Amino acid sequence: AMPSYNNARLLEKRLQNCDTQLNQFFNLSIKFLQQLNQIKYFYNSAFNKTENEDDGLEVVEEYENFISLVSQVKSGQINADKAFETIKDTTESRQADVIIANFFKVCE
């Protein structure tokens, strides 16, 4: 992993499963690929900025919950509004709210 605290490498292995799971979902428009790359840049960059294992674990868990929501939206289990409601209160950055809500509506 990029952070240097102990066991970050183990957390990195779960970052890559999320990135791989996103690719396998959509496996397209250039615009969608830019939004897809924006999402993966958001979570990977957020993990690389963590400085202790608790913060790195919270980002990895947040990426994993996002992956679960994408599958539920893309497979038609819930609509994009249900998905965005699930994480809007725990998402502090409003710029993250915008890209995550837009990505849910794309999958629908």
GROMACS .gro file of N, CA and C in nm:
model
  324
    1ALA      N    1   0.083  -0.120   0.000
    1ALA     CA    2   0.000   0.000   0.000
    1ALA      C    3   0.086   0.126   0.000
    2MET      N    4   0.024   0.241  -0.025
    2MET     CA    5   0.096   0.367  -0.028
    2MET      C    6   0.118   0.423   0.113
    3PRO      N    7   0.018   0.422   0.202
    3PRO     CA    8   0.047   0.457   0.341
    3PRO      C    9   0.144   0.358   0.403
    4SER      N   10   0.222   0.406   0.500
    4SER     CA   11   0.333   0.329   0.554
    4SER      C   12   0.305   0.269   0.692
    5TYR      N   13   0.184   0.284   0.745
    5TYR     CA   14   0.157   0.223   0.874
    5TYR      C   15   0.138   0.072   0.859
    6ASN      N   16   0.156   0.001   0.970
    6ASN     CA   17   0.146  -0.144   0.969
    6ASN      C   18   0.012  -0.190   0.914
    7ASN      N   19   0.015  -0.297   0.835
    7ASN     CA   20  -0.102  -0.368   0.783
    7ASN      C   21  -0.180  -0.288   0.680
    8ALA      N   22  -0.126  -0.176   0.632
    8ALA     CA   23  -0.191  -0.106   0.522
    8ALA      C   24  -0.198  -0.193   0.397
    9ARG      N   25  -0.099  -0.280   0.376
    9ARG     CA   26  -0.099  -0.368   0.260
    9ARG      C   27  -0.219  -0.461   0.261
   10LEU      N   28  -0.256  -0.513   0.378
   10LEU     CA   29  -0.375  -0.597   0.386
   10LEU      C   30  -0.501  -0.518   0.351
   11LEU      N   31  -0.508  -0.393   0.395
   11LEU     CA   32  -0.620  -0.308   0.356
   11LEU      C   33  -0.617  -0.275   0.208
   12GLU      N   34  -0.498  -0.266   0.149
   12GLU     CA   35  -0.486  -0.239   0.007
   12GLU      C   36  -0.545  -0.352  -0.077
   13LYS      N   37  -0.530  -0.477  -0.033
   13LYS     CA   38  -0.586  -0.589  -0.107
   13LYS      C   39  -0.737  -0.579  -0.119
   14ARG      N   40  -0.803  -0.516  -0.022
   14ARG     CA   41  -0.947  -0.497  -0.032
   14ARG      C   42  -0.984  -0.376  -0.117
   15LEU      N   43  -0.895  -0.276  -0.125
   15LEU     CA   44  -0.915  -0.168  -0.221
   15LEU      C   45  -0.920  -0.221  -0.363
   16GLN      N   46  -0.831  -0.316  -0.395
   16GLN     CA   47  -0.821  -0.366  -0.532
   16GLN      C   48  -0.939  -0.456  -0.568
   17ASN      N   49  -0.994  -0.529  -0.471
   17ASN     CA   50  -1.115  -0.606  -0.497
   17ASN      C   51  -1.230  -0.514  -0.537
   18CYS      N   52  -1.244  -0.401  -0.469
   18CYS     CA   53  -1.347  -0.304  -0.505
   18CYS      C   54  -1.324  -0.250  -0.646
   19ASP      N   55  -1.200  -0.215  -0.679
   19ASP     CA   56  -1.170  -0.166  -0.814
   19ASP      C   57  -1.196  -0.272  -0.919
   20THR      N   58  -1.162  -0.398  -0.889
   20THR     CA   59  -1.188  -0.507  -0.982
   20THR      C   60  -1.338  -0.534  -0.994
   21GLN      N   61  -1.409  -0.530  -0.882
   21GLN     CA   62  -1.553  -0.552  -0.885
   21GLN      C   63  -1.625  -0.446  -0.967
   22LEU      N   64  -1.577  -0.322  -0.963
   22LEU     CA   65  -1.637  -0.218  -1.046
   22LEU      C   66  -1.616  -0.247  -1.194
   23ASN      N   67  -1.495  -0.288  -1.232
   23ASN     CA   68  -1.469  -0.321  -1.372
   23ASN      C   69  -1.558  -0.436  -1.419
   24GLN      N   70  -1.574  -0.539  -1.335
   24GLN     CA   71  -1.653  -0.655  -1.375
   24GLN      C   72  -1.801  -0.621  -1.387
   25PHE      N   73  -1.849  -0.523  -1.310
   25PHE     CA   74  -1.985  -0.475  -1.328
   25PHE      C   75  -2.007  -0.427  -1.471
   26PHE      N   76  -1.918  -0.342  -1.520
   26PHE     CA   77  -1.930  -0.279  -1.651
   26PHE      C   78  -1.822  -0.338  -1.742
   27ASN      N   79  -1.849  -0.458  -1.792
   27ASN     CA   80  -1.750  -0.534  -1.867
   27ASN      C   81  -1.814  -0.610  -1.982
   28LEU      N   82  -1.888   0.099  -2.390
   28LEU     CA   83  -1.933   0.201  -2.298
   28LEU      C   84  -1.897   0.342  -2.345
   29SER      N   85  -1.972   0.439  -2.294
   29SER     CA   86  -1.948   0.579  -2.326
   29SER      C   87  -1.820   0.628  -2.260
   30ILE      N   88  -1.750   0.718  -2.329
   30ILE     CA   89  -1.630   0.779  -2.272
   30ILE      C   90  -1.665   0.857  -2.146
   31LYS      N   91  -1.780   0.924  -2.147
   31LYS     CA   92  -1.823   1.001  -2.030
   31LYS      C   93  -1.843   0.910  -1.909
   32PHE      N   94  -1.904   0.793  -1.929
   32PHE     CA   95  -1.920   0.700  -1.818
   32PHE      C   96  -1.784   0.655  -1.765
   33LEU      N   97  -1.689   0.627  -1.854
   33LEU     CA   98  -1.557   0.585  -1.810
   33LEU      C   99  -1.485   0.696  -1.734
   34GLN      N  100  -1.514   0.822  -1.765
   34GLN     CA  101  -1.457   0.931  -1.686
   34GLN      C  102  -1.521   0.938  -1.548
   35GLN      N  103  -1.651   0.913  -1.540
   35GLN     CA  104  -1.717   0.910  -1.410
   35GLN      C  105  -1.674   0.788  -1.330
   36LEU      N  106  -1.658   0.673  -1.397
   36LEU     CA  107  -1.607   0.554  -1.330
   36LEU      C  108  -1.467   0.577  -1.275
   37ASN      N  109  -1.379   0.636  -1.356
   37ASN     CA  110  -1.243   0.665  -1.309
   37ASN      C  111  -1.243   0.769  -1.198
   38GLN      N  112  -1.337   0.863  -1.202
   38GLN     CA  113  -1.347   0.961  -1.095
   38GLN      C  114  -1.383   0.895  -0.962
   39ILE      N  115  -1.475   0.798  -0.966
   39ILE     CA  116  -1.514   0.727  -0.845
   39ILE      C  117  -1.395   0.650  -0.788
   40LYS      N  118  -1.323   0.577  -0.873
   40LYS     CA  119  -1.211   0.498  -0.823
   40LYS      C  120  -1.098   0.587  -0.773
   41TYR      N  121  -1.075   0.700  -0.839
   41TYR     CA  122  -0.978   0.796  -0.789
   41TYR      C  123  -1.018   0.851  -0.653
   42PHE      N  124  -1.149   0.873  -0.631
   42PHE     CA  125  -1.195   0.929  -0.504
   42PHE      C  126  -1.162   0.837  -0.386
   43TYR      N  127  -1.191   0.708  -0.399
   43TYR     CA  128  -1.171   0.618  -0.286
   43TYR      C  129  -1.025   0.579  -0.269
   44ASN      N  130  -0.955   0.554  -0.379
   44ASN     CA  131  -0.813   0.522  -0.370
   44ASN      C  132  -0.732   0.639  -0.313
   45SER      N  133  -0.759   0.762  -0.360
   45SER     CA  134  -0.688   0.877  -0.307
   45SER      C  135  -0.721   0.900  -0.160
   46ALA      N  136  -0.845   0.873  -0.120
   46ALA     CA  137  -0.882   0.893   0.020
   46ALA      C  138  -0.811   0.794   0.111
   47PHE      N  139  -0.790   0.671   0.063
   47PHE     CA  140  -0.717   0.573   0.144
   47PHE      C  141  -0.570   0.608   0.155
   48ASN      N  142  -0.509   0.654   0.045
   48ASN     CA  143  -0.368   0.689   0.045
   48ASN      C  144  -0.337   0.809   0.134
   49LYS      N  145  -0.437   0.890   0.167
   49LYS     CA  146  -0.417   1.002   0.257
   49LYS      C  147  -0.432   0.964   0.404
   50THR      N  148  -0.484   0.845   0.433
   50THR     CA  149  -0.497   0.801   0.571
   50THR      C  150  -0.359   0.784   0.633
   51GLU      N  151  -0.352   0.806   0.764
   51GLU     CA  152  -0.225   0.801   0.835
   51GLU      C  153  -0.225   0.701   0.951
   52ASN      N  154  -0.339   0.639   0.980
   52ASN     CA  155  -0.349   0.535   1.081
   52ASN      C  156  -0.446   0.430   1.030
   53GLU      N  157  -0.441   0.311   1.092
   53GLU     CA  158  -0.517   0.198   1.040
   53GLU      C  159  -0.668   0.216   1.057
   54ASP      N  160  -0.711   0.290   1.159
   54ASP     CA  161  -0.855   0.310   1.178
   54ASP      C  162  -0.915   0.392   1.064
   55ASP      N  163  -0.846   0.498   1.021
   55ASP     CA  164  -0.896   0.578   0.910
   55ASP      C  165  -0.890   0.501   0.779
   56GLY      N  166  -0.781   0.427   0.756
   56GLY     CA  167  -0.774   0.343   0.638
   56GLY      C  168  -0.884   0.239   0.633
   57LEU      N  169  -0.918   0.181   0.748
   57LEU     CA  170  -1.026   0.083   0.753
   57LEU      C  171  -1.161   0.147   0.724
   58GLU      N  172  -1.181   0.271   0.769
   58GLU     CA  173  -1.310   0.337   0.746
   58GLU      C  174  -1.330   0.369   0.598
   59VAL      N  175  -1.223   0.405   0.528
   59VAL     CA  176  -1.233   0.432   0.385
   59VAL      C  177  -1.257   0.303   0.308
   60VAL      N  178  -1.186   0.196   0.344
   60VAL     CA  179  -1.205   0.068   0.277
   60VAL      C  180  -1.347   0.017   0.296
   61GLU      N  181  -1.400   0.030   0.418
   61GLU     CA  182  -1.539  -0.007   0.443
   61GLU      C  183  -1.635   0.081   0.364
   62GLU      N  184  -1.604   0.210   0.351
   62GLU     CA  185  -1.692   0.300   0.277
   62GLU      C  186  -1.694   0.264   0.129
   63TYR      N  187  -1.579   0.229   0.073
   63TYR     CA  188  -1.573   0.184  -0.065
   63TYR      C  189  -1.651   0.054  -0.084
   64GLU      N  190  -1.644  -0.036   0.014
   64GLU     CA  191  -1.713  -0.164   0.003
   64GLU      C  192  -1.865  -0.146   0.007
   65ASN      N  193  -1.914  -0.059   0.095
   65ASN     CA  194  -2.057  -0.030   0.098
   65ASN      C  195  -2.102   0.035  -0.032
   66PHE      N  196  -2.019   0.122  -0.089
   66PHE     CA  197  -2.052   0.182  -0.218
   66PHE      C  198  -2.064   0.075  -0.327
   67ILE      N  199  -1.974  -0.023  -0.326
   67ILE     CA  200  -1.979  -0.131  -0.425
   67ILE      C  201  -2.110  -0.208  -0.411
   68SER      N  202  -2.151  -0.237  -0.288
   68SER     CA  203  -2.278  -0.307  -0.266
   68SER      C  204  -2.395  -0.228  -0.321
   69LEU      N  205  -2.393  -0.096  -0.304
   69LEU     CA  206  -2.502  -0.013  -0.354
   69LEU      C  207  -2.505  -0.011  -0.506
   70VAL      N  208  -2.388  -0.007  -0.570
   70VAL     CA  209  -2.382  -0.009  -0.716
   70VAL      C  210  -2.447  -0.136  -0.770
   71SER      N  211  -2.415  -0.251  -0.709
   71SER     CA  212  -2.473  -0.377  -0.755
   71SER      C  213  -2.625  -0.377  -0.740
   72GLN      N  214  -2.675  -0.321  -0.629
   72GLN     CA  215  -2.820  -0.317  -0.608
   72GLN      C  216  -2.888  -0.225  -0.709
   73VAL      N  217  -2.823  -0.114  -0.745
   73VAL     CA  218  -2.881  -0.023  -0.843
   73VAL      C  219  -2.874  -0.083  -0.983
   74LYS      N  220  -2.756  -0.131  -1.023
   74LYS     CA  221  -2.739  -0.181  -1.159
   74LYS      C  222  -2.826  -0.304  -1.185
   75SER      N  223  -2.842  -0.390  -1.085
   75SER     CA  224  -2.926  -0.509  -1.102
   75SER      C  225  -3.074  -0.480  -1.081
   76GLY      N  226  -3.111  -0.356  -1.051
   76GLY     CA  227  -3.251  -0.320  -1.041
   76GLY      C  228  -3.317  -0.351  -0.909
   77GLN      N  229  -3.240  -0.376  -0.803
   77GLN     CA  230  -3.301  -0.405  -0.673
   77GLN      C  231  -3.355  -0.279  -0.608
   78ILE      N  232  -3.283  -0.167  -0.619
   78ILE     CA  233  -3.326  -0.039  -0.566
   78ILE      C  234  -3.298   0.068  -0.671
   79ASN      N  235  -3.364   0.182  -0.657
   79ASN     CA  236  -3.340   0.293  -0.748
   79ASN      C  237  -3.228   0.381  -0.692
   80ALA      N  238  -3.184   0.477  -0.774
   80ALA     CA  239  -3.071   0.560  -0.737
   80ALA      C  240  -3.099   0.645  -0.614
   81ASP      N  241  -3.225   0.683  -0.591
   81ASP     CA  242  -3.257   0.762  -0.473
   81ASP      C  243  -3.239   0.682  -0.345
   82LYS      N  244  -3.286   0.557  -0.344
   82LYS     CA  245  -3.263   0.471  -0.228
   82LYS      C  246  -3.114   0.458  -0.199
   83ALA      N  247  -3.033   0.440  -0.303
   83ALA     CA  248  -2.889   0.421  -0.284
   83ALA      C  249  -2.824   0.547  -0.227
   84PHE      N  250  -2.858   0.664  -0.282
   84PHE     CA  251  -2.797   0.787  -0.234
   84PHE      C  252  -2.841   0.821  -0.092
   85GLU      N  253  -2.967   0.793  -0.058
   85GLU     CA  254  -3.013   0.811   0.079
   85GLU      C  255  -2.928   0.733   0.179
   86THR      N  256  -2.875   0.618   0.137
   86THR     CA  257  -2.804   0.530   0.229
   86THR      C  258  -2.674   0.592   0.280
   87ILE      N  259  -2.610   0.678   0.201
   87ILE     CA  260  -2.476   0.726   0.234
   87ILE      C  261  -2.465   0.877   0.238
   88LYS      N  262  -2.574   0.951   0.213
   88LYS     CA  263  -2.562   1.096   0.204
   88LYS      C  264  -2.527   1.159   0.338
   89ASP      N  265  -2.578   1.104   0.449
   89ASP     CA  266  -2.554   1.164   0.580
   89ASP      C  267  -2.413   1.137   0.630
   90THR      N  268  -2.352   1.026   0.589
   90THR     CA  269  -2.217   0.991   0.630
   90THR      C  270  -2.112   1.037   0.530
   91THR      N  271  -2.153   1.106   0.424
   91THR     CA  272  -2.063   1.162   0.325
   91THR      C  273  -2.050   1.311   0.353
   92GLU      N  274  -1.932   1.353   0.398
   92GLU     CA  275  -1.916   1.491   0.442
   92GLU      C  276  -1.895   1.586   0.325
   93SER      N  277  -1.805   1.552   0.234
   93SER     CA  278  -1.777   1.639   0.120
   93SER      C  279  -1.898   1.645   0.028
   94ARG      N  280  -1.943   1.767  -0.004
   94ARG     CA  281  -2.054   1.780  -0.097
   94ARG      C  282  -2.012   1.744  -0.239
   95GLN      N  283  -1.885   1.766  -0.275
   95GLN     CA  284  -1.837   1.720  -0.404
   95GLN      C  285  -1.845   1.569  -0.417
   96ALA      N  286  -1.825   1.496  -0.307
   96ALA     CA  287  -1.844   1.352  -0.310
   96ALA      C  288  -1.991   1.315  -0.323
   97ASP      N  289  -2.080   1.392  -0.258
   97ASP     CA  290  -2.223   1.371  -0.276
   97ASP      C  291  -2.263   1.379  -0.422
   98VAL      N  292  -2.207   1.476  -0.495
   98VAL     CA  293  -2.247   1.499  -0.634
   98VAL      C  294  -2.203   1.382  -0.722
   99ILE      N  295  -2.077   1.340  -0.711
   99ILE     CA  296  -2.027   1.236  -0.799
   99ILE      C  297  -2.088   1.100  -0.763
  100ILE      N  298  -2.117   1.077  -0.635
  100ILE     CA  299  -2.173   0.948  -0.595
  100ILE      C  300  -2.320   0.938  -0.634
  101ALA      N  301  -2.395   1.046  -0.616
  101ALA     CA  302  -2.535   1.046  -0.658
  101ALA      C  303  -2.547   1.034  -0.809
  102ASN      N  304  -2.462   1.106  -0.883
  102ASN     CA  305  -2.464   1.096  -1.028
  102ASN      C  306  -2.430   0.955  -1.075
  103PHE      N  307  -2.334   0.890  -1.009
  103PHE     CA  308  -2.296   0.755  -1.051
  103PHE      C  309  -2.408   0.655  -1.025
  104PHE      N  310  -2.485   0.673  -0.918
  104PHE     CA  311  -2.599   0.585  -0.893
  104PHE      C  312  -2.705   0.600  -1.002
  105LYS      N  313  -2.738   0.724  -1.039
  105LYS     CA  314  -2.837   0.746  -1.143
  105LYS      C  315  -2.790   0.695  -1.279
  106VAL      N  316  -2.659   0.689  -1.301
  106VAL     CA  317  -2.607   0.633  -1.426
  106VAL      C  318  -2.635   0.483  -1.433
  107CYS      N  319  -2.612   0.412  -1.322
  107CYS     CA  320  -2.632   0.268  -1.320
  107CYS      C  321  -2.778   0.231  -1.339
  108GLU      N  322  -2.870   0.319  -1.301
  108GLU     CA  323  -3.012   0.293  -1.316
  108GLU      C  324  -3.054   0.314  -1.461
   0.00000   0.00000   0.00000
